[PDB]
Amino acid sequence: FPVPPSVDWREKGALVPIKNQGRCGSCWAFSAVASVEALNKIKGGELISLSEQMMVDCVNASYGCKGGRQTDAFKYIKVHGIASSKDYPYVGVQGPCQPKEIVLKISGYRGIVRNNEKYLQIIASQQVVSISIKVGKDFQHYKSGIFNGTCGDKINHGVNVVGYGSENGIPYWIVRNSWGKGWGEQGYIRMRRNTSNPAGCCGVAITPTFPVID
Numbered sequence: 001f002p003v004p005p006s007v008d009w010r011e012k013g014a015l016v017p018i019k020n021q022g023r024c025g026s027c028w029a030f031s032a033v034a035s036v037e038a039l040n041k042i043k044g045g046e047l048i049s050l051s052e053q054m055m056v057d058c059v060n061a062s063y064g065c066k067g068g069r070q071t072d073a074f075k076y077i078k079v080h081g082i083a084s085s086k087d088y089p090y091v092g093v094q095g096p097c098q099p100k101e102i103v104l105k106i107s108g109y110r111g112i113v114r115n116n117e118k119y120l121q122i123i124a125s126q127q128v129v130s131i132s133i134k135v136g137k138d139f140q141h142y143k144s145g146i147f148n149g150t151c152g153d154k155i156n157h158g159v160n161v162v163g164y165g166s167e168n169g170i171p172y173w174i175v176r177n178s179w180g181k182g183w184g185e186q187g188y189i190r191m192r193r194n195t196s197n198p199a200g201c202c203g204v205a206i207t208p209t210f211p212v213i214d
């Protein structure tokens with residue numbers, strides 16, 4: 001597959017503004033939802049912000065603000081769909097599953113073979129990817145540049161790959177986070193790409209998944 005040297009889905013209008021999950025352990029929902037939002041736009045839909053709150057409240061295979069799985073949200077969006085953020089706003093606490101108009105359903109999801117950054121690049125050239133990484137102190141304190149700091153000890157935070165590029169010959173991934181616009185580079189982090197460890201920088205390549213429509 002012919003792969004461009006750089007991709008930034010924000011320049012294609014496929015990312016809503018950065019969100020802030022707050023103190024709630026809902027990264028699984030933010031990571032799933034951003035990938036669905038972007039794919040809806042990429043396939044020809046209108047860019048719409050979709051409700052992580054509905055995932056926190058309704059995806060009983062996951063644990064609300066106590067953690068969860070991107071794949072549980074994809075399965076739920078396949079069967080039952082997802083409402084807009086406008087109709088089902090994020091409050092950062094679990095409540096009852098509230099009935100709201102559904103914006104869309106998806107058809108399923110796929111994984112990428114683990115520990116293969118060039119395979120992650122092939123999918124990232126086509127859509128936003130959900131990934132899970134090992135966050136520790138150095139990642140928490142990231143402000144700008146290409147991150148190459150130390151990592152946490154466990155896979156503990158779901159984020160999204162929204163593109164990739166290089167600066168002065170150093171390749172990176174563009175990673176969307178859910179810690180508000182005041183963290184990092186307007187809410188994003190560039191993480192070193194094509195590392196010696198095939199799991200990627202703090203594990204970016206360990207468990208990539210992405211939704212599919214049709």
Ligand SMILES: *[C@@H](C(=O)O)[C@H](O)C(=O)N[C@@H](CC(C)C)C(=O)NCCCCNC(N)=[NH2+]
Pocket residue numbers: 021024025026027028029066067068069070132133155156157158
């Ligand atoms: C992430 C966050 O809010 O920063 C949030 O704690 C979360 O969703 N964590 C997930 C893992 C990330 C998506 C990588 C999590 O805790 N998953 C575990 C759920 C329980 C699964 N049980 C077993 N045995 N795996």
